[PDB]
């Protein structure tokens, strides 16, 4: 929802990110990023607040595994500058399984969530315990 401001995209394709929701997915492999035009040789890149197509790891519930699913990045270890000059980073790269319509597969989100993801996706902000 809404125009975003370019931030530093720290997660290239192949990044395995932790899963913050209670979807029974332990890790989310990153197949690709939504709204990515490409340049020759450039791996798709994703930042906080971005829909990426993920695949649940072997550790995940089998029902969720073997399916390409949309997810929103809510944490990133790469430091990024908000237009207010604030440079922020998370301890771990994370994601929540969301449908393009914003609906969350998991009821709750365990851990801190970034402001960018909370503002872009209303359902993330409502379920977030904290929005740092």
């Amino acid at each position: 929802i809404g125009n975003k401001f370019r931030i530093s995209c720290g997660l290239p394709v192949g990044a395995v990110i932790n899963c913050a929701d209670n979807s029974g997915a332990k890790s989310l492999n990153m197949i690709a990023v939504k709204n990515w035009k490409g340049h020759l040789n450039r791996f798709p890149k994703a930042s906080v607040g971005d829909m990426v197509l993920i695949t649940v790891g072997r550790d995940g519930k089998p029902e969720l595994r073997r399916k390409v699913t949309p997810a929103v990045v809510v944490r990133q270890r790469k430091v990024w500058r908000r237009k207010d000059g604030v440079w922020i980073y998370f301890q771990d790269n994370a994601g929540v399984i969301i449908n393009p319509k914003g609906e969350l597969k998991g009821s709750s989100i365990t851990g801190p969530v970034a402001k960018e993801a909370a503002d872009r996706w209303p359902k993330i902000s409502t379920t977030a315990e904290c929005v740092h």
């Binding site: 125009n3 401001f5 340049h39 020759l40 040789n41 237009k83 207010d84 000059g85």
Partner: protein, 377 residues
């Protein structure tokens, strides 16, 4: 055969030849349009880049994530010492283009301008302008030349020199430039305005306004001979590549049988005359004013000079113009600034709540040395 995969070309062919700038400093080339019937104004000023700062400002862009929010942006301070007008030049729009209809110099020319006319001042005849001062100094000769300009000149320009003494750089010779007089009801009104400014300092505050956009012309930082990876931005080859990987692998096809001007080739990387257009002017002020960089938030003295002084520049003794963002060139390099030819229509109103006066040498934690003294005790 075809390239197989579509990729753009690396680099702008418009900026070729990428050679060391022959022109000594940044040159204005095209000045902003006259817009006859506007107020009479000077379109350009020369200053020397002091350094960057970082300021907090209140954004009023409607239709934005930052509307009614605060943003920290890079600001470049260019030390602009007052420039004394020394001569008026008039050009006519002939069928062969703008052709000079003579320049009328002042009756008394300052020593910094004189220094420009010799390679070494101490070992020189110092004969420049000797006859002219004798012919002039009554003003009658100058008046006749001004009248000739009113009768035959279409474009009036002022020749002014930066006084290098007021700047920290080790120059002594003054940089002399032409500043087009614009906005005139008549050419003679333009000559009259220029004559008033003759032998008289001109200030940035009386050339440019705050919130207005300028174009910064200057030669850029130089890196010397560079490779095609760091000159044209070409892809480094895989590390298995024998004979090195930092090179364009194929410099052309069998036909044409001669390398093209497009193909990327190693050579000079910096010292290029560039123009950075549409930079908005955050503040024009004097360093002599003690509270120039003080804001309602600061509640301290705060002046343009940072703690520890400007790295690789100096003390900015006099007037300065702080622009928004980066301009071409390193510190000390002259930057000619002109009114923007094509300004960005939608630019956010400038409101500054904080300017960084912390040390740019190292990491500074204190805006002013009195705070540093208090902390250490």
């Amino acid at each position: 055969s075809h390239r197989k995969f579509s990729c753009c070309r690396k680099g702008n062919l418009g900026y070729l030849p990428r050679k060391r700038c022959t022109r000594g400093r940044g040159r204005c080339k095209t000045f902003p349009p006259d817009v006859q019937g506007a107020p009479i104004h000077l379109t350009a000023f020369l200053g020397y880049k002091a350094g960057c700062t970082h300021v907090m400002r209140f954004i009023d862009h409607r239709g934005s994530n930052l509307h009614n929010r605060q943003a920290i942006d890079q600001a470049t301070i260019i030390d602009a010492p007052p420039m004394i007008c020394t001569a008026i030049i008039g050009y006519a729009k002939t069928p062969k283009g703008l052709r000079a209809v003579t320049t009328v110099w002042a009756a008394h020319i300052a020593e910094p301008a004189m220094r420009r006319f010799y390679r070494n001042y101490f070992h020189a005849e110092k004969t420049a302008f000797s006859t002219y001062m004798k012919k002039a100094a009554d003003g009658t000769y100058i008046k006749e030349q001004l009248g000739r300009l009113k009768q035959h000149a279409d474009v009036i320009r002022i020749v002014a020199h930066t006084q290098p003494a007021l700047t920290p750089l080790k120059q002594k010779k003054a940089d002399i430039m032409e500043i087009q007089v614009n906005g005139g009801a008549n050419v003679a009104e333009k000559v009259d305005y220029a004559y008033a400014l003759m032998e008289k300092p001109i200030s940035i505050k009386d050339v440019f306004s705050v919130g207005a956009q300028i174009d910064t012309i200057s030669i850029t930082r130089g890196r010397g001979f560079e490779g095609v990876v760091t000159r044209w931005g070409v892809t480094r080859l895989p590390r298995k590549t024998r004979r090195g990987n930092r090179k364009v692998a194929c410099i052309g096809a069998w036909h044409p049988a001669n390398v093209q001007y497009t193909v990327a080739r190693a050579g000079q990387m910096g010292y290029f005359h560039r123009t950075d257009t549409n930079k908005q002017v955050f503040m024009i002020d004097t360093a002599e004013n003690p509270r120039c960089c003080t804001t309602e938030f600061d509640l301290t003295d705060k002046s343009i000079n940072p703690v520890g002084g400007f790295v690789n520049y100096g003390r900015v003794q006099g007037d300065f113009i702080m622009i928004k963002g980066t301009c071409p060139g390193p510190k000390r390099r002259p930057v000619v600034m002109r009114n923007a030819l094509l300004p960005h229509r939608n630019c956010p109103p400038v409101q500054l709540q904080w300017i960084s006066t912390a040390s740019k040498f190292g990491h500074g934690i204190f805006e002013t040395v009195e705070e540093r003294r208090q902390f250490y005790a």
